[PDB]
């Protein structure tokens, strides 16, 4: 007894999310193999989620001057919204994926000349500075600045939000709001320079992606 087998009609193939089931199917032929390159024309790792979406991104550049009074808010911005911009590589991962869940890494670098004096504050505020005390900001995870000792601090805070995932197209409220206020006034004499720079390097940590969208 001989039997000539025929082609199967039903087939469940495709990709992760794009799912197709066909009634008229055929055998997918395959020749060759995925060839590796021994004399590597690229000595670093390829593009991946781990190295692209988590890397320090400059979001704002201001300049702390001498004419600022006490407890003047130097910077007032959204850490999440400034990372949503066309000029970054995190635009490439967040454009097709709507939902977002992430931790916030903060590193702020300033550069004073040592013939000045004064100090700053860098707190991480959830939501808004609605009725929080200026003098009680150290309860927040903060990092201070000094013209005597250091010029680099870092702050690692988790996702503080009323929900779990994030919507980019219509946010209810900003998730984090990085604040920088004048902790001590910047004084100079004669000849000492009356400017010193300020930069905020921010990046995401522990990103999830859910629910792909067709729209931009």
């Amino acid at each position: 007894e001989q039997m000539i087998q025929s082609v199967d009609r039903t087939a469940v193939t495709g990709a992760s999310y794009f799912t197709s089931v066909d009634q008229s199917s055929v055998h997918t032929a395959e020749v060759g193999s995925h060839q590796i390159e021994p004399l590597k024309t690229s000595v670093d790792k390829p593009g991946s989620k781990k190295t692209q979406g988590e890397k320090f991104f400059l979001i704002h550049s201001a300049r702390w001057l001498t004419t600022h009074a006490l407890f003047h808010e130097v910077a007032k911005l959204d850490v999440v919204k400034l990372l949503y911009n066309e000029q970054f590589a995190v635009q490439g991962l967040l454009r097709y994926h709507t939902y977002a869940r992430f931790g916030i890494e903060i590193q702020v670098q300033i550069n004073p000349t040592p013939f000045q004096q004064g100090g700053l504050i860098c707190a991480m505020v959830p939501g808004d500075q609605s009725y929080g005390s200026i003098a009680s900001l150290t309860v927040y995870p903060h990092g201070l600045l000094n013209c005597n000792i250091n010029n680099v601090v870092r702050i690692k805070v988790p996702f503080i939000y009323t929900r779990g995932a994030y919507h980019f197209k219509d946010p209810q409220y900003p998730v984090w709001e990085l604040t920088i206020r004048v902790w001590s006034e910047l004084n100079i004499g004669t000849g000492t320079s009356a400017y010193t720079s300020l930069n905020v390097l921010a990046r995401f940590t522990d990103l999830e992606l859910h629910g792909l969208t067709p729209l931009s």
Binding site: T41, S42, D44, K55, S61, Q87, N111, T192, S193
Partner: protein, 196 residues
């Protein structure tokens, strides 16, 4: 020939002035072993790098490159820089890149202040062809044959803050060293000074 190549030899020179704007392009560099621009008037001589003389005697080259940007500031200067790597060829309109668009490309941040000057920035082999040809023997441009696997841009990531009793510029030297270098198919070609 490894003795001459990986030793850091001066290839260029650019200062860091204080009269510039945030994100202004200072100097664009075609990243290749064929890079030299310095000279001297007395005596009549054009300064060559030890890497370029080894590689100017070949048709093809392949290997990584290590730049060494040594600054000479005072102890009171400050500000930062951004050493972005823009790949491709030697001929695009590279001076239209926004500073936040350079954050997608691989890079390295750096503080000017401190007690360590030289940041050894290494160049990966970002290329479409495994063998990169010496096109400088020819005199006609041709798509397909390149010499630079990328272009370096030192951005004005922050401005220069300084006291009054020093100058308003911080000079950055450009050494040139290489690692994992490979060259074959010899020739003879006396290279010309790249005036960018």
């Amino acid at each position: 020939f490894t003795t001459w190549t990986s030793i850091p030899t001066l290839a260029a020179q650019f200062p860091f002035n204080a009269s510039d704007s945030v994100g202004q392009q200072i100097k664009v560099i075609p990243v290749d072993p064929y890079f030299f621009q310095m000279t001297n008037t007395n005596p009549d001589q054009k300064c060559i790098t030890a890497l370029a003389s080894i590689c100017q005697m070949f048709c093809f080259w392949r290997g990584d490159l290590v730049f060494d940007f040594q600054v000479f500031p005072t102890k009171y200067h400050s500000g930062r820089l951004l050493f972005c790597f823009v790949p491709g060829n030697e001929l695009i309109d590279v001076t239209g890149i926004t500073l936040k668009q350079a954050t997608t490309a691989p890079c390295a941040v750096m503080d000017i202040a401190g007690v360590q000057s030289t940041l050894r920035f290494r160049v990966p082999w970002i290329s479409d062809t495994p063998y990169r040809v010496n096109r400088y023997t020819k005199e006609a441009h041709q798509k397909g044959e390149y010499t630079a696997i990328g272009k370096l841009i030192v951005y004005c990531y922050n401005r220069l803050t300084s006291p009054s009793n020093v100058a308003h510029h911080v000079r950055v030297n450009v050494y040139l060293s290489a690692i994992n270098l490979e060259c074959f198919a010899p020739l003879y070609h006396a290279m010309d000074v790249t005036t960018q």
